Design a protein around this ligand. Structure first.
Ligand SMILES: Nc1nc2c(ncn2[C@@H]2O[C@H](COP(=O)(O)OP(=O)(O)O)[C@@H](O)[C@H]2O)c(=O)[nH]1
Ligand code: ALF
Ligand SMILES: [Mg+2]
Lengths: 125, 450
RNA sequence: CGACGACGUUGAUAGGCCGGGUGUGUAAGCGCAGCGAUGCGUUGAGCUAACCGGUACUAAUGAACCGUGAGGCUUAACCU
RNA sequence: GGCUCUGUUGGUUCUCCCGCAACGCUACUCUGUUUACCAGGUCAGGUCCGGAAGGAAGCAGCCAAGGCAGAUGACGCGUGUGCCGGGAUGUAGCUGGCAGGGCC
């Protein structure tokens, strides 16, 4: 009985999940857009975005904290020098999810997932 | 004057560097005064100037011709972006009846706007419209709205000065819901932000009818008071948009920028005239384009810019089409260079290990084959060349009939072109030394020719 | 699993975001004290899942598709 | 001290016609590009006939031309401008002057 229970198992044990979301988060932040399964990507929301909320306030504490979330310096320095300023005036909803066809091998539903400003800052550059 | 002042400023201060904050001083001052003469709210002017600074720090200006021109371009882009987007329209989707509330100062043209929107929604949107006058103050205002409604062919809800705005708009809303009206237009009395009773009145009305659309009607000639009016009206009511009137005048109309910045509400309408049939949609680029007068300076510049644009476009497209990969164009070039330079006798000598296995006389004559190939290629359109994968049987028929040969030969040359494309693709993917050393002579067994 | 329930922009259905509650128990940095471990001050600090209250920031699409066009015969009882 | 309506006259609005001057609207065409063979012209290359002389079917390119757009002159449909324009017409409506009564 699942009542009011949040989080999705995705057929992995605990630590495995945690890690997978760290690298998925890292990967997204780095490329600003990725293609993954639908449910993995609905769980990624709940990781990546709070990171962003973290970067919207700059201090040594938060740098460190997000490092402990993602374990990468490239990712954190990007987070605070780019995404922090970028989304500064927006409330939540930093990611957009777009469903597409099915992974040909296993027939899984796929979704691109991306930062909302992926487009306009890739055009203006 | 803008272009002249900016160009003069950027020329006299600095030579050709990459533009820096120190050079934008007099620029920002002249732009400031330009907006001050444009009747733009001073805080809006400053807050815009800040953005101009932010854009000035990273200037790519150095590579262009006229710095003032592209600076003008940046300012125009920022201003248009500040004006909002286009195709802004009231939400007539809404659950009928759609209630539109009017708000503004005295003599703002709210009533005429009600008439205009009445005719506009009636004729173009095929909507059933009911109009009502909440003004018990202004003499013959109700008669005016009734007259306009009679002219635009829109039903009018009777009202008098002996009644109260609340009961009036409530009875109007009730009548709109009972008769299944599509759109309910509510005209209200012009009021000042310093008036408490009138603000409480329009607040009680807005709370009563719960309009899906709340419009703010302000004159285009409005001065620095536009800031106070916009702020007060925005804080008093949740405006769904702003309606600018008397735009046809020679007025600068910076009040639009003022209200747009402060309220944050988009402008959905621009009154182009006094008459009811005259109305225009709000175009950010059009409004942000002109506060000025000039001549003969901008034409040549726009011409030169167009020339540079089309030149850079064509030159980049030419490299882009050739940069897609290997095609029948490069194949054609290599084939004509082949038939001109054809080395069959010499290439038989140049090759050593392939001649020891394959036959010595197996080399085909270059002239006939390559002339055939050239001529058959000459039967092909430019599209079938750059994009070889669209070639089908009927096109092969056209080609074969054009060159006066058999379709199988066309298929043969398409096969050879497929081989050449594959090979050159392998040359592009790997090294020429790894790929030249990866070339292998196929032998189906250690017996020769078997 | 089908199924039932809510919602699909005229929208609080989901996540986010803001506020609270809860839980843990005074973060990190800095300053002071001590030879040093550690302690004291900033400080009930910092973080906080599934909770509660708000907020259209992201996704809930304009459409299309299924479904039709007054509904058998007989008899009776009223009605022309 | 004001007003109304008759006699006469000056304007104005509406309906019809027209002049001068002063502001504003479609369909076609000129440029921008587009359309493989199956509308057309030139038709390279190649190919067909001939010893030769030369002709021929016709691909591509180009030009019409056919799609889609950026605006050029005349036709078609309108007008709170001025000459209080010139007229026709109302048994009309509105307004003013004058000769005035009468009502307060
Ligand atoms: N030129 C022009 N005049 C306008 C516009 N809107 C209103 N007016 C003028 O405003 C005058 C009356 O304004 P009104 O509607 O009565 O003011 P409100 O009822 O308080 O909003 C009219 O004589 C119009 O000529 C417009 O968009 N353009
Ligand atoms: F003149 Al108004 F409302 F008609 F102030
Ligand atoms: Mg009014």
């Amino acid at each position: 009985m699942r009542h009011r229970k949040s989080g999705r198992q995705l057929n992995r044990n605990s630590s495995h999940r945690q890690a997978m979301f760290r690298n998925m988060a890292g990967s997204l932040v780095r490329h600003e857009i990725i293609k993954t399964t639908l449910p993995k990507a609905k769980e990624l929301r709940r990781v990546v975005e709070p990171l962003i909320t973290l970067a919207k306030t700059d201090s040594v504490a938060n740098r460190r904290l997000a490092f402990a979330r993602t374990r990468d310096n490239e990712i954190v320095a990007k987070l605070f020098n780019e995404l922090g300023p970028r989304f500064a005036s927006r409330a939540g909803g930093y990611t957009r999810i777009l469903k597409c066809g099915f992974r040909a091998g296993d027939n899984a539903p796929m979704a691109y997932i991306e930062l909302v400003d992926r487009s306009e800052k890739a055009e203006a550059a | 004057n803008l272009t002249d002042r900016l160009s003069r400023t950027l020329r006299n201060i600095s030579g050709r560097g990459r533009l820096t904050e120190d050079n934008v001083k007099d620029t920002l001052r002249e732009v400031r005064m330009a907006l001050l003469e444009a009747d733009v709210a001073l805080p809006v002017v400053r807050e815009f100037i800040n953005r101009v600074k932010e854009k000035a720090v990273g200037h790519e200006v150095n590579k262009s011709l006229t710095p003032g021109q592209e600076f003008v371009k940046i300012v125009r882009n920022e201003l248009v972006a500040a004006m909002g987007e286009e195709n802004q329209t009231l939400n007539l989707a809404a659950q009928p009846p759609a209630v539109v509330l009017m708000a503004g100062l005295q003599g703002a043209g709210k009533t005429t706007s009600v008439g205009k929107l009445g005719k506009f929604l009636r004729e173009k949107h095929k909507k059933k419209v009911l109009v009502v006058s909440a003004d018990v103050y202004r003499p013959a205002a109700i008669k005016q709205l009734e007259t306009l409604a009679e002219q635009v062919g829109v039903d009018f809800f009777p009202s008098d000065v002996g009644q109260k705005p609340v009961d009036i708009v409530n009875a109007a809303l009730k009548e709109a819901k009972l008769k299944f009206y599509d759109v309910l237009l509510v005209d209200t009395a012009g009021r000042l932000h310093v008036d408490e009773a009138m603000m409480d009145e329009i607040k009680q009305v807005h709370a009563s009818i719960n309009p899906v659309e709340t419009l703010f009607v302000v004159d285009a000639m409005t001065g620095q008071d536009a800031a106070n009016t916009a702020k007060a009206f925005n804080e008093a009511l949740p405006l769904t948009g702003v309606v600018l009137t008397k735009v046809d005048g020679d007025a600068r109309g910076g009040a639009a920028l003022s209200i747009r910045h402060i309220t944050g509400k988009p402008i959905k309408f621009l009154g182009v005239g006094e008459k009811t049939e005259a109305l225009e949609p709000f175009h950010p680029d059009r409004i942000a384009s002109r506060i000025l007068g000039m001549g003969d300076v901008l034409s040549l510049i726009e011409d030169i810019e167009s020339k540079v644009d089309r030149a850079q476009a064509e030159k980049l497209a030419s490299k882009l089409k050739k940069g897609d990969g290997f095609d029948l164009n490069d194949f054609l070039e290599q084939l004509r260079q082949m038939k001109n330079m054809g080395g069959x006798x010499x290439x038989x000598x140049x090759x050593x290990x392939x001649x020891x296995x394959x036959x010595x006389x197996x080399x085909x004559x270059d002239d006939k084959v390559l002339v055939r190939m050239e001529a058959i290629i000459n039967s092909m359109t430019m599209k079938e060349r750059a994009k070889p994968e669209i070639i089908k049987g009927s096109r092969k028929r056209r080609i074969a009939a054009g060159c006066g040969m058999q379709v199988q030969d066309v298929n043969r040359l398409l096969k050879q072109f497929d081989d050449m494309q594959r090979m050159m693709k392998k040359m592009k993917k790997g090294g020429x030394x790894x790929x030249x050393x990866x070339x292998x002579x196929x032998x189906x067994x250690x017996x020769x020719x078997x």
